[PDB]
Design an enzyme around this catalytic site. Structure first.
Site, PDB file in Angstrom:
ATOM      1  N   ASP A  66       0.821  -1.270  -0.124  1.00  0.00           N
ATOM      2  CA  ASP A  66       0.028  -0.158  -0.042  1.00  0.00           C
ATOM      3  C   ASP A  66       0.988   1.413  -0.090  1.00  0.00           C
ATOM      4  O   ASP A  66       1.833   1.302   0.900  1.00  0.00           O
ATOM      5  CB  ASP A  66      -1.091   0.072   1.171  1.00  0.00           C
ATOM      6  N   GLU A 123       7.945   6.072   5.753  1.00  0.00           N
ATOM      7  CA  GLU A 123       9.122   6.637   5.384  1.00  0.00           C
ATOM      8  C   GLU A 123       9.024   8.070   5.913  1.00  0.00           C
ATOM      9  O   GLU A 123      10.018   8.767   6.392  1.00  0.00           O
ATOM     10  CB  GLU A 123       9.425   6.709   3.938  1.00  0.00           C
TER      11      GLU A 123
END
Ligand SMILES: [Zn+2]
Ligand SMILES: [Zn+2]
Lengths: 113, 134, 109, 134
Positions: free
Chosen positions: D78, D86
């Site tokens: 996803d 991140e």
């Protein structure tokens, strides 16, 4: 001519290969009964690695003879560390610039990552 | 007759006695210049155990060295293909990972579904060339 | 400190770590959005590797071992948090190696 | 209001404009001591391309650095969870690969089936804590 299993790390570094230098790309490769690792094409990469017959400088034995490169300096370094045919190895090569790198390696599947 | 008879020691691989015999039978009936024979002060040996790397061979490519057969890998991949494949390295053949199932030296490249233990025409020719003058 | 992706090769060598020395075991590990490699436990391995905070000597954290001489080396080469690294450590014997590592997931291969 | 407003540059990631926007909205609604600015002469940047290693972040952990989003990985995993995860590293959070799907910082650890893009209360509080005086 010695044969053994291989487990390697390959990297491309921006510059001379100094400790603070940027690692542009890296990948892992393992050749035994199966060709695997994080390498996008392990089968092709392992075959290309075995063609060197232990001498990693042979990854530069087939350069692009027609590719005309500029003679400026923007260094790039390729590395190979790990187990090659059952023995621990460490190799590196720094090129004048990226063109020189492209031309010398000539799309060798090992660095096609 | 063979130009050379290569001795192998299967004693250190008790779990793979049948696949080691199968490999020797496949190769002896595939090539004429070299023959494999079971024995004691062997040129090369078979070992077994657990290795995260799986099965492999550490050899000079001319009958000397050793073959290691991994327990888990030989449960997922066909044991006879694995053993015959690794025996091919001691006979001097390299791997061709990009090769198909019809190519014994492609090993695990075509995946676990591949069960062919026999070397192809080119493979049989290459081993005969390598053992032609001993 | 600094965070980056890692791509490593770990080995266990019979001896001092000389070029002719036999490799007893080796594996690959890659840590980025996903923990992968040929390592039997990548998730545990990657978390153990990140716990060192760049200093691989932190992998060594000290039953009674007999005093026999049979050297063995542990090595680590590759990219650690986006920087190229090379590390090795030589133990007097395997018992001393197991005692110092004490089942660190990085060498659990 | 927040202690610090961190500027990001999404211009070098045109294929992920929506997931970059979703990540910033997820974090701005999850933490109060730090907020993410749509763009300008940014502290950190988003890039896209192809990397065998997949998506990753190279950061000091205190708003500076860059995030690289891989094409193939964002088709299997996803994209919003990848981007939010991140962005968490630039906010100073480490990875916890052994963690479950409820833990945003476990990343790809729980596998591709995991679609949760929201940080749990423990993640949210560490981030609030790291930007309290910072
Ligand atoms: Zn093979
Ligand atoms: Zn992460």
């Amino acid at each position: 001519s010695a044969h053994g299993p291989s487990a390697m790390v390959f990297t491309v570094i921006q510059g001379s290969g100094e400790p603070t230098d940027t690692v542009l790309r890296a990948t892992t490769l393992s050749c035994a009964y199966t060709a695997e690792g994080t390498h996008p094409a392990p089968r092709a990469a392992c075959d290309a690695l075995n063609a060197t017959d232990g001498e990693l400088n042979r990854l530069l034995a087939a350069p692009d003879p027609s590719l005309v490169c500029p003679m400026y300096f923007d260094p790039v370094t390729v590395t190979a560390d790990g187990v090659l045919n059952g023995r621990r190895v460490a190799w590196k090569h720094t090129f004048s610039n990226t063109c020189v790198m492209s031309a010398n390696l000539n799309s060798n599947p090992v660095y096609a990552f | 007759g063979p130009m050379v008879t290569v001795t192998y020691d299967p004693s250190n691989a008790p779990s793979f006695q049948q696949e080691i015999a199968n490999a020797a039978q496949i190769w002896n009936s595939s090539v004429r210049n070299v023959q494999l024979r079971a024995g004691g002060n062997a040129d090369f040996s078979y070992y077994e155990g657990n290795d995260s790397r799986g099965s492999y061979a550490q050899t000079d490519g001319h009958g000397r060295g050793y073959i290691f057969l991994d327990y888990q890998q030989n449960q997922q991949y066909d044991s006879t293909r694995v053993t015959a494949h690794e025996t091919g390295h001691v006979l001097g053949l390299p791997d061709h990972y990009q090769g198909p199932c019809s190519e014994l030296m492609s090993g695990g490249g075509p995946g676990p579904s591949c069960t062919n233990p026999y070397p192809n025409a080119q493979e049989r020719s290459r081993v005969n060339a390598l053992w032609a003058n001993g």
